[PDB]
Write a protein that binds this ligand. Sequence first.
Ligand SMILES: NC(=O)c1ccc[n+]([C@@H]2O[C@H](COP(=O)([O-])OP(=O)(O)OC[C@H]3O[C@@H](n4cnc5c(N)ncnc54)[C@H](O)[C@@H]3O)[C@@H](O)[C@H]2O)c1
Ligand SMILES: NC(=O)c1ccc[n+]([C@@H]2O[C@H](COP(=O)([O-])OP(=O)(O)OC[C@H]3O[C@@H](n4cnc5c(N)ncnc54)[C@H](O)[C@@H]3O)[C@@H](O)[C@H]2O)c1
Lengths: 320, 320
Amino acid sequence: NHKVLLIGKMYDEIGEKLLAEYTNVEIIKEPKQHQIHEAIQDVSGVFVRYPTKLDAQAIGLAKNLKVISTSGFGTDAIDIAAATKRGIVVVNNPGLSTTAVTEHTLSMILALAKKLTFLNQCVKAGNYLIRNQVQPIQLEGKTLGIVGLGMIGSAVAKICSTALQMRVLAYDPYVPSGKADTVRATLVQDLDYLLTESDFVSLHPELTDETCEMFDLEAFKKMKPSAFLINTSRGKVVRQPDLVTAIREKLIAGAAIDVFEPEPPAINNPLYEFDNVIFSPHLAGVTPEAGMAAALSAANQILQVLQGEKPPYIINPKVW
Amino acid sequence: NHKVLLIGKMYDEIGEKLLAEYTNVEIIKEPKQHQIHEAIQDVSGVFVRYPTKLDAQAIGLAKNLKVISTSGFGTDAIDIAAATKRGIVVVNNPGLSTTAVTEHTLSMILALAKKLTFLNQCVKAGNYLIRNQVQPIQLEGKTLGIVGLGMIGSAVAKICSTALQMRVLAYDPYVPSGKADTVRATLVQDLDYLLTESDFVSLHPELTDETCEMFDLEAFKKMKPSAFLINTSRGKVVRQPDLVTAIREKLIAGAAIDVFEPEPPAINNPLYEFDNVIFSPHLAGVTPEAGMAAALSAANQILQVLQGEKPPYIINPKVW
Ligand SMILES: NC(=O)c1ccc[n+]([C@@H]2O[C@H](COP(=O)([O-])OP(=O)(O)OC[C@H]3O[C@@H](n4cnc5c(N)ncnc54)[C@H](O)[C@@H]3O)[C@@H](O)[C@H]2O)c1
Ligand SMILES: NC(=O)c1ccc[n+]([C@@H]2O[C@H](COP(=O)([O-])OP(=O)(O)OC[C@H]3O[C@@H](n4cnc5c(N)ncnc54)[C@H](O)[C@@H]3O)[C@@H](O)[C@H]2O)c1
């Protein structure tokens, strides 16, 4: 008897089939606003594919709505205030993609070190002789600076220190030094030391008021001119105009970016111009395996709310 | 009193400085044939930067020449027959870049799995919404097929099986099964099984009559349509027209190529057209660290011959 609207497909169809066994499911892909308005009127649950926005108008039209689930961690595209006003439960699906982001981070570190995209373009252009001018970087013995020694930061640190034989430094004010020792990294309390020491800086912190735009022009100035920045965390950790300046003025050597501010990025983003910046469209956490886990978690939590059971990942717990 | 000619720079200047302390060194970069002819007339030793060719004419003009050293393993660009006729020692510099090629191989496996070059182009073109159509591959649990369980094959196997938690199969007729167990791989005697099982096939064999063009159309037909080929070994291991067919006809999903046949490749190579084939210009073994080791080895062996000491890596030992 309950109806559920998926605003965008889940990252794996198993969550859609789980929902369809217990509710009447409708899926709308890259919808126009009027389609959201018509399809949401009588549904009891809503799923939102990141980074699609769910606004106050649509929530106000959703007369029967009891639960909203995002596809992953981020809830910035949901008008949570409007949902909370109406007593609607908002749920996210976090921490299900550690392995996916760890692998993606490694791919980006290696791609920057081996100058992958540049050398590929040179060969295809007939310039095999570029090998007389540029050489890859050997990762062994170089220093990797990890900002945020959490689930993904620790996993990346462990692979880079042991398999790749890098020297790993980690900055994270909320962790004991023993947590870095576990993954054969060294914890450092001075972010400046991490910046001046690192040949690769990879960002993995939680986004907070403290980490918001912590990577600004002053940070890039302290980094080695030869160093690379990798960001798979959140776009707001980096102040985008300063990264543009830093790349253009050669304060750093390059960057690999999976996350943007804003999300989605505009089509004229000034970073696109630079051949030493490489991009993925917020996919580090979206392998099929991570997608299946997130889709099951989203489907489960919707069904839980509809049956009056408290789900694990409520974002606005005061409505419960 | 001895003069030495470097036909191309070494991969690190330390070898040039070592030579200049004991001999009179001249360096010519991307030289025309007439420059080789003039500079080689009176030199006692010659260094050749891969893949530059040293032909019978130049050797015949080199009246005082006693030793020729390549920059790395490959000697196919040297007219060894002509050198041997004149009693000239030919030396290569092999096995000094295991870590460099291992890292490069990993970079290419990860770049193919994460669809790096394609997703980068999509974002820069304003197509962030490609994330609704393509997803990265999670390496954990996938099968890597290694052809050739030597120094580089073993090192790659070990990282992929342990750090990346892949299932690793290895084909190598000259190795005991215990050598695969050491790196948490399984040795397989049926190359067909490796082909049908593997999601990634990475080539690391010695080039022999047996491995020459072992990766031909029949091999690609047996591979999974979803699988990727990585080749950092030698270009002649793959029959290039068949790889073109295999890519065009979607017998396999993509490839990453560091080595070519012929070397250097022509500017109209038919593989360049395909966006799912990525290239590096024979640089997997050429980091600064590998380059310094090879340059010291080349400089040492030249000086050894000039002082009548047998060098370790003679390619034509019957002249000694
Ligand atoms: N690109 C994607 O698809 C994707 C997927 C999953 C997670 N993420 C993001 O990646 C990042 C890491 O994820 P996680 O699961 O490891 O989170 P986590 O909660 O396990 O760890 C985050 C770390 O950030 C640390 N931190 C907090 N403040 C800090 C500060 N001022 N300086 C340095 N570190 C600080 C915390 O102490 C914690 O250890 C998060 O921003 C997460 O939202 C991105
Ligand atoms: N791209 C570069 O810059 C670069 C640099 C160094 C080496 N290489 C090449 O990489 C490859 C691996 O180098 P390595 O140092 O590990 O060599 P290696 O001699 O240590 O191992 C080569 C392996 O090939 C195996 N092999 C022989 N015949 C085989 C067959 N029919 N099928 C499967 N395996 C077979 C041998 O048994 C051996 O174990 C070689 O071709 C080498 O010349 C390339």
